[PDB]
Write a structure and sequence with these properties.
This is part of a larger assembly, with 2 copies of chain A, 2 copies of chain C, 1 copy of chain E, 2 copies of chain F, 1 copy of chain H and 1 copy of chain I.
Chain F (H helix, E strand, L loop, with lengths): L9 E5 L4 E4 L56
Antiparallel strand pairs in F: 1-2
Chain H lengths: L1 E4 L10 E4 L5 E4 L5 E5 L4 E5 L4
Antiparallel strand pairs in H: 1-3, 2-3, 4-5
Chain I lengths: L2 H24 L2 H6 L11 E2 L3 E12 L2 E11 L4 E2 L7 H4 L18 H48 L7 E7 L12 E8 L17
Classes of the chains: A alpha+beta, C alpha+beta, E alpha+beta, F little secondary structure, H mainly beta, I alpha+beta.
Chain lengths: 151, 151, 140, 137, 173, 78, 78, 51, 209
Amino acid sequence: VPKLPCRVDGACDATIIKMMTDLNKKGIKVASVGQNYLISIPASALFADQSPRLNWASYSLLNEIAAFLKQFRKIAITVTSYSSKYVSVKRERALTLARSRVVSEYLWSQGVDSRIIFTQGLGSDKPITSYTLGGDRSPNARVEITFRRAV
Amino acid sequence: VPKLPCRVDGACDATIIKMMTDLNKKGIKVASVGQNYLISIPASALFADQSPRLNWASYSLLNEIAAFLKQFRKIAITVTSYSSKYVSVKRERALTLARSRVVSEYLWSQGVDSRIIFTQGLGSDKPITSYTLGGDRSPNARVEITFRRAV
Amino acid sequence: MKFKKPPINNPSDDATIKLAEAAVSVSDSMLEMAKVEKVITPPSKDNTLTIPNAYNLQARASVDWSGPIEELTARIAKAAHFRFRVLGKSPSVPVLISISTKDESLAEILRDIDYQAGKKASIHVYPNSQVVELRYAKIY
Amino acid sequence: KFKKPPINNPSDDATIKLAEAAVSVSDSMLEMAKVEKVITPPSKDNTLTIPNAYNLQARASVDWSGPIEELTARIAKAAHFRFRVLGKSPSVPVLISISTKDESLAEILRDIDYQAGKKASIHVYPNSQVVELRYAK
Amino acid sequence: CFHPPYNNFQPDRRAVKRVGVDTGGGTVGLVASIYRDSKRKIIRDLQKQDIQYVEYGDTRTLIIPTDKYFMFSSPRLNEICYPGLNNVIRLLNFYPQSTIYVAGFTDNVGSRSHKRKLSQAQAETMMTFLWANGIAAKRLKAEGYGDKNAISDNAIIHGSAQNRRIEIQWFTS
Amino acid sequence: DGCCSKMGGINYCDSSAGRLVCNNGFYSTCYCTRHAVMDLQFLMGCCLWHGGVYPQLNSSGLVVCNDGYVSEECSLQK
Amino acid sequence: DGCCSKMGGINYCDSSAGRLVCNNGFYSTCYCTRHAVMDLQFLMGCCLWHGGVYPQLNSSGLVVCNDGYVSEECSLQK
Amino acid sequence: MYVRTNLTILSPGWLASMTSADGTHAYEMQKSPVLLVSWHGKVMQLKVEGL
Amino acid sequence: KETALSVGAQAGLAWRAKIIDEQLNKQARNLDAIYDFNSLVLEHNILPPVLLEGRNTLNLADAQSIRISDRTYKVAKQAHFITTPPTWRQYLWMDYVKPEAPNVTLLPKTKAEKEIWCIYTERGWKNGIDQANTILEENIARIKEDFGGMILYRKLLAMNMVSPPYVSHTDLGVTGDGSEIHIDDRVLRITALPELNVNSAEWRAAVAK
């Protein structure tokens, strides 16, 4: 006990439940089924209008994401990007790929002790609704991040 | 402390900084980049007009600049002279060489422990001011001592 | 009118000083090592013939792994939705590789895995059938 | 608002040299391996390709470590193919060892030929349903 | 009112906010703007940051440290030190005539080709960042030297850190 | 006493050059490790430029270096 | 200290996982078994990466590892 | 010393190794108080008493 | 007395050691990046040997006897088999033990005793600091020596001035009695140790471009 750690470092699951509740209060989707965890973020809350540029206000949200993400001992994080339909196919594919690349690059710069970060973006191939009113206003244009908690 | 010398003999950083600021207030150009130091002295406040003769007041300036130059451990010094375009090529060239010889001789008689004193002068080949209205008053004619502090 | 020089940073440490002092010497030795090897034997062919790249391999990855080989390969196969296959048998001595890199194509990741594998193993892709195959060496 | 700097940044003037040395030694050793590896072209690789007949698409869990002939006759009878031999069996048996849970008999045969090496080879004729084991002298 | 990412490349307006919050005296706000935008205070703030400014003869030069005004082992630019870049563009607006030379410098670790490649990349990145802020393309020249000439030495670590640098020169006519 | 006095101040003792680093980027006038470059010209000690002092306990006031040559100033006066 | 705090509380210790179970269906961040997946990046002791300390002792404070190495940094000097 | 686990021992060397049908590993080594393994690429140590 | 000085030397040695191990652990990844061994291992899991090269040597044997050599080469440790790549943790990781015994005899009672206590303690402390750094630099020198010898073997084999190792393997089928059996037998032996060559024709000269 004086030489062995009583817990994993930086762990306060009370604070984890608090920040998870606060995340859903913000409206960023937190999904927990089994040991697989899903976080979903609307793209309008992250980028400009079909642009691969980070809004400068969003870095606080990103810091909150990393503070949550540092908690759980993990292996692999998958990042998927989804968009609307704007001009062509490969244009949307490229924009999604760039967006997922940027968030993966900043997160891998940050301290999340994964071993694997996979990233891909697919454009508008798997929508989550038939409601297609806006462009980036529509909720299907989004970024999802998934992982499996291990042990 | 009783046998180990704490600092290098006969040098203090406060003295170095104060005398460097005094030189800059006097208007003699002093520049420090990396481990390299360049000191530039205008000709008009030192020599006679286009002629290798010395005012009696100039020995005071040579005195204090030698006292500053003793503060650093040195290895090799370079003395280079620059003049104005006056009559010829070789007349100005030999004037530069004579001026360099005099200042190098007095410095070598003074207490700088350089292993190497190099001396040369180039006349009026490379200027540093295209405004060449003045004669010896114009700042393109001067002398420079350049050296590198080692370890 | 005070003076400054452009590097000004956090404090250092003597152990790091001596470590870098060793490291630059090993770097120089490895550099001339590689140069004299490169001249003394001619390169023939890079692995790009036996592993090309195709569609859906272009998803990207940041990877730090320092263990055995085939489970990392299986993770990559699960990423690519490509069917895994082993050929030969693993030796009793495990084959260990270390990867510290970031933001590459999976095709070049697997090429680097093949290059770090040495003579112990090889890897091929059959993209028409979407099969990722790892073959062992048939010695011992 | 707050763009955070990287956390494990090389903020020491010695450790930036250390990291640069790490980059240099990584690229140089990668070059060393690249110039020293020997590869084979897939234009004439000596691996048995897939026969893609319908008789050879089933799944099995098979474990064996021993002689070759009983195992290959059994998988031939499983695939309803006749089995034939060419050459003389050596004094020592050519030993193979395959243990797997769920894949197909085509790649079973492929892995058998890959572990065969220079001692023997295998052949499949699907028009006349035959499987031939060819020894080497 | 302002954006920390380079104010979206706009021609900025700083002193109007200053005189507005000073009215919240017009003359004292205006002379406070004068004292803030005065060139000596610009240079003193540049020296408060880690930026070296040399003026000599008619040619003026600037020295930038790579490790705080770059990202490591990359042509990526650190976003934290944007006040230095804003001050750089603010100062270089004063000399709208002569041409500009930029040079990149490394230490002596690794392949010579690698050093030359990295220096070329850094020089091109700094050049095009200068290009985007308003000065047109015919007045710019970029060059990345390796370790071919140094202001310092490389046997001692802090000297080696002083060696790697970015150099800016501009003439007058 | 202040090695980086009336300036930025002490950063650290670099052991490569054996010098303090001032916060303004200059090497100090002081020293911090014994493996530095000092202008050493004057020494102490006895039986120098020979085998050193032979460290035995002698019965008399004679003291002899390890080469066999003696030193009467190292020895006493009687 | 409260491992499954701010939930229903501690259910029990799953020793296959070596982990506590919270009363809601979520894993704790504490442990209960010494056979647990814990990261270990700092150690104590002497003669590490060697044969270990010798059970026999020296008359002096010299300590000798089992593989013949002698560790002055554990030993006492003079 | 004799050890049975399912991890991959790295540092102090060994003399005899065995693997079961299910990846269970058994090793025979010299006595040492510290072991080194790679769990999932992350490297870890093991503290062993009784020596 | 001097007991405070000695125990302060012990404490300073311990504290410098703990901070050194902390820093050495925290800088982790580039360390094993630059000290690879498994990329350097040979074909049959053989640790390749270590070689030493000396240039332009002069010996005076005695009064009026001298020998001059241009380059000398020496095999330090003979190559052998191995089951694991050696790592830096058996070269660099210092030992650590908390010293829990300040002998409570000579506690101060007067301020002069406190003064001499303080000064003797700090000079012992700096002694312990310098001793620990000496241990660290000896360790880094020895591991640098090991790696240098290994890579020098690699480039001598590139320059065709050493024999490669030679290995024969014998193969048997099933063996043993009716109660103990083994499916296969592979006996892996090495006959020829790697060694230098002495002739003149086989020297392979290098060039660059």
